């Protein structure tokens, strides 16, 4: 039998939420930017020998519409929290997402993965160590990804599935 996972991709405008999702789902990348309102995808995959149905909600980076954003967090089972390694403000924003998820879920233990995207670009402004230390302080995994080269894309989503499994089986 299979198992379904409700993943939600969050992070600041332009960090690559959609590009990551499209690489996972459709195995391609383009430079052209299509700003998101809201998109949802379903994909069957095998993770660690188990058949999984991934439901992925690709959210917009904008920060308004708290009623809708809160509902995304209430329904979601795990959160891919994305910043870009060449966008310092997007990294500084990350703690807002952790705070909002903990507030809406009323818990300090929510499945989440910190993702430093655009790791192919030679314009880094956020050091890997800074992000590793922040994730360690939250008790969550951290991975660097590139939606362009595909580095880490499957691993980021599969790690999030593994975090949800651990939380549900605890």
């Amino acid at each position: 039998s299979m198992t379904e996972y409700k993943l939600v991709v969050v992070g600041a405008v332009g960090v690559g939420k959609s590009a990551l999702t499209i690489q996972l789902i459709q195995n391609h990348f383009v430079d052209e930017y299509d700003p998101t309102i809201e998109d949802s995808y379903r994909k069957q995959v095998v993770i660690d020998g188990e058949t999984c149905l991934l439901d992925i909600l690709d959210t917009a980076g904008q920060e308004e519409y708290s009623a809708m954003r809160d509902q995304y967090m209430r329904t979601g089972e795990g959160f891919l929290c994305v910043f870009a390694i060449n966008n310092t403000k997007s990294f500084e924003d990350i703690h807002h997402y952790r705070e909002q998820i903990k507030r809406v879920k009323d818990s300090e233990d929510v499945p989440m993965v910190l993702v430093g995207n655009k790791c192919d670009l030679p314009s880094r402004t956020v050091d890997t160590k800074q992000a590793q230390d922040l994730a360690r302080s939250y008790g969550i995994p951290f991975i660097e990804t590139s939606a362009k080269t595909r580095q880490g894309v499957d691993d980021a989503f599969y790690t999030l599935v593994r975090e949800i499994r651990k939380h549900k089986e605890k």
Partner: protein, 165 residues
């Protein structure tokens, strides 16, 4: 003087749908009204003619005006790529209000939106500078081509535009 009026002839995959005209509130928002007026006539050598209403969300608005990248990300004003928020005197009071799209404070270019409902949470963030005069029924038709995520079921364009006497 009399606020200017401009028209858009709206098309659906190139076929005429109908005309929408707008009063531009030059008396209250002159710099922003003048940008939209000039982009509607094309007199600077660029402007709205041929561009798409790329994002239409039923219950909220019809957004368009990207004549530079043709993909919802672009646009430019007659003053440069961007210009400052002129004032917030007018509000998003109901259907037919014409307001500037933006990416945050002081980033007005060419993209704009026509409200199809009151959108009061945009007050103080988007500069209102005009309203539909004739053709709300055409805006209602445009709205039916939209969807939750703004993608349209057929391509909605400004086939012609200009200034009325």
């Amino acid at each position: 003087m009399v606020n200017p009026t401009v028209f858009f002839d709206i098309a659906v995959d190139g076929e005429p749908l109908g005309r929408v005209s707008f009063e531009l509130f030059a008396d209250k928002v002159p710099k922003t009204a003048e940008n939209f007026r000039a982009l509607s006539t094309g007199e600077k050598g660029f402007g709205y003619k041929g561009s798409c209403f790329h994002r239409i969300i039923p219950g909220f608005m019809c957004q368009g005006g990207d004549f530079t990248r043709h993909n919802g990300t672009g646009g430019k004003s007659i003053y440069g790529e961007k210009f400052e928020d002129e004032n917030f005197i007018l509000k998003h009071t109901g259907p037919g209000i014409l307001s500037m799209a933006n990416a945050g404070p002081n980033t007005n270019g060419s993209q704009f939106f026509i409200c199809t409902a009151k959108t009061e949470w945009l007050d103080g963030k988007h500069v209102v500078f005009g309203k539909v005069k004739e053709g709300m029924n055409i805006v209602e038709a445009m709205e039916r081509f939209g969807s939750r995520n703004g993608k349209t079921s057929k391509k909605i364009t400004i086939a012609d535009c200009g200034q009325l006497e």
